[PDB]
Design a protein around this ligand. Structure first.
Ligand SMILES: CNc1nccc2ccccc12
Ligand SMILES: [Cl-]
Ligand SMILES: [Cl-]
Ligand SMILES: [Cl-]
Length: 163
C-alpha cells in the first residue's frame, strides 16, 4: 500500500505515466483501437496477447513485469443510459480488484467511456464518481490522466472537495 493513499490528476499521455501499473481504456476485442487504447498499444504491444474481455470487466496482461489492466467501459452509442451506467460502474469495480490482486502501490487510470464511447455526452462527473466508488477502499496512489485543460481543473476540484 502507499503510506498515505492519495488521488492526483495529470494532463499528459498515460503512456508516459510514473506509476507501477496502467489501466487501458480497452475495446472488448483486444484491438489496437484509437485514443488512450492506441497510445497503450504503441507503448506496451505485448500486453495485447489474449487481452479480449467483455464490457464491464478488466483483464490484466503483463508487458515484461509491468501490468496493463484492460478495462472495457460501455459504448453509450449502443447501451441505454441505465445499462451503460451499470456496466461503467462494474468496469471500475473490476479495476479495483485487479489493482488489489497485483499488490501495486500506484496506478495510472483514464476516465472510462468519456471519449469515443461517450455517445457524444460530457461524462466527466459520471465516470469520475464511479472511479471513486471503486478505488476509495484500495490503498494504491491513484493518478488520473486527462488531455483537456478544463477537465484537469474540474478533476482537481472534485479531488480537493473531498479534501
Ligand atoms: C491521457 N489520455 C490519452 N493518452 C494517450 C492518448 C490520448 C489520445 C486521445 C485522448 C486522450 C489520450
Ligand atoms: Cl504528454
Ligand atoms: Cl472512451
Ligand atoms: Cl480529457
Amino acid at each position: 500500500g502507499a503510506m498515505a493513499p492519495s488521488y492526483r490528476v495529470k494532463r499528459m499521455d498515460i503512456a508516459k505515466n510514473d506509476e507501477e501499473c496502467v489501466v487501458n481504456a480497452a475495446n472488448p476485442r483486444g484491438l489496437p483501437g484509437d485514443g488512450v487504447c492506441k497510445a497503450v498499444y504503441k507503448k506496451w504491444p505485448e500486453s495485447f496477447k489474449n487481452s479480449a474481455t467483455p464490457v464491464g470487466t478488466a483483464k490484466t496482461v503483463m508487458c515484461g513485469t509491468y501490468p496493463v489492466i484492460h478495462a472495457v467501459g460501455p459504448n453509450f452509442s449502443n447501451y441505454t443510459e441505465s445499462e451503460g451506467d451499470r456496466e461503467l460502474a462494474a468496469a471500475y469495480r473490476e479495476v479495483a480488484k485487479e489493482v488489489t490482486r497485483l499488490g501495486v502501490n500506484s496506478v495510472a487510470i483514464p476516465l472510462l467511456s468519456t471519449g469515443v464511447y461517450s455517445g457524444g455526452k460530457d461524462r466527466l462527473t459520471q465516470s469520475l464518481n464511479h472511479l471513486f466508488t471503486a478505488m476509495d477502499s484500495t490503498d494504491a496512489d491513484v493518478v488520473i490522466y486527462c488531455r483537456d485543460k478544463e477537465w484537469e481543473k474540474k478533476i482537481s476540484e472534485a479531488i480537493q472537495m473531498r479534501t
